[PDB]
C-alpha cells in the first residue's frame, strides 16, 4: 500500500489519484510527514502541493515519470507555509505552470517561500473564480474562510470521493490543531465547517498531517476550533 521511493512515500487512493508524502525533521517536533496528491486526468498530471524540499519535490516528478509517465500540466499549492509550497523552485525548474490563492502568492516572500506563477481568486461564496483556475480538469477549488492560515485553500476530485483540506483538516483522533501561529482563532471554526459543506458527498478526507479519514475529521476539527475563540 506504501511504496517507498526515497525518501518519500507514495499511496495509491482512487485509479487516478494517489497521495505524496514526504519528511522534514522540524527541532522540537520529529520527522513529520507532509501529504499531497497526484491527479491523472486524461493525458496529463496534476499536482496539489509540493514537498517540503526542491530535492523532495524533483522526487516526486521522477516518481510520476516512472509510475504514470505523462506531462505535468500543473501544480496547485494550498498555502504559503513550506510543506506545501517549499518546493516551487524544482516546478518551475522542470517547466511547470504553478497556482496559488493570490494571497498565498502575496505572503510568499515575507514566509521564505517562492511565489505561484499564477493567482487564483474567489468568489464571495468560496468557489475559485474560473477564469483563474483555467485547464483545472477534475480539480475544485475551495477557498473555505481563513483558519490555519489566513490563505488556505482546498481542493476536491471530481469524479472520486476524495476532498484534500491541507492543514485546515485534522483526522478523528487529533488532540489538537497545530501550527496556530498564523491561525484566524475567531473564524477557524466556521472555515472547516464551510469545507464540509463546500463537498457534501466526499468521503474520504485527505489531509497534510495525518493519513485519510472519514468526514468525522471535519466535525472534529470544527467540534476543536471552536475552543480557539
Ligand atoms: C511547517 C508546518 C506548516 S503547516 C507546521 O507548522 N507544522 C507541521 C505540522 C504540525 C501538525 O499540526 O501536525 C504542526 C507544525
Ligand atoms: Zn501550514
Ligand atoms: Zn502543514
Same mark, same amino acid.
Do not use: C, I, R
Given at each position: 500500500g506504501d511504496q517507498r521511493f526515497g525518501d518519500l512515500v507514495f499511496r495509491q =487512493?482512487? #485509479?487516478?489519484?494517489?497521495?505524496?508524502?514526504?519528511? =522534514?525533521?522540524? #527541532?522540537? *517536533?520529529?520527522?513529520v510527514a507532509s501529504n499531497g496528491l497526484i491527479v491523472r486526468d486524461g493525458g496529463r498530471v496534476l499536482v496539489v502541493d509540493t514537498a517540503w524540499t526542491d530535492d523532495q519535490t524533483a522526487q516526486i516528478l521522477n516518481w510520476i515519470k516512472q509510475e504514470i509517465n505523462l506531462p505535468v500540466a500543473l501544480a496547485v499549492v494550498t498555502h504559503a507555509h513550506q510543506d506545501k509550497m517549499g518546493g516551487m523552485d524544482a516546478l518551475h525548474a522542470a517547466g511547470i505552470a504553478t497556482y496559488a490563492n493570490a494571497l498565498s502568492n502575496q505572503l510568499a516572500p515575507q514566509e521564505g517561500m517562492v511565489a505561484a506563477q499564477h493567482? =487564483?481568486? *474567489?468568489?464571495?461564496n468560496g468557489w475559485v473564480?474560473?477564469?483563474?483556475?483555467?485547464?483545472?480538469? #477534475? =480539480?475544485?477549488? *475551495?477557498y473555505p474562510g481563513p483558519g490555519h492560515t489566513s490563505d488556505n485553500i482546498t481542493v476536491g476530485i471530481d469524479g472520486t470521493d476524495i476532498a484534500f483540506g491541507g492543514c485546515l483538516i485534522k483526522d478523528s483522533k487529533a488532540k489538537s490543531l497545530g501550527n496556530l501561529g498564523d491561525a484566524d482563532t475567531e473564524h477557524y471554526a466556521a472555515s472547516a465547517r464551510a469545507f464540509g459543506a463546500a463537498f457534501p458527498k466526499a468521503s474520504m478526507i485527505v489531509m497534510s498531517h495525518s493519513a485519510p479519514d472519514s468526514r468525522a475529521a471535519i466535525t472534529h476539527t470544527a467540534r476543536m476550533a471552536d475552543k480557539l475563540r
Open positions: =487512493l482512487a #485509479p487516478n489519484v494517489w497521495q505524496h508524502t514526504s519528511y =522534514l525533521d522540524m #527541532p522540537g *517536533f520529529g520527522a493567482s =487564483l481568486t *474567489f468568489a464571495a473564480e474560473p477564469a483563474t483556475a483555467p485547464n483545472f480538469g #477534475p =480539480l475544485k477549488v *475551495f
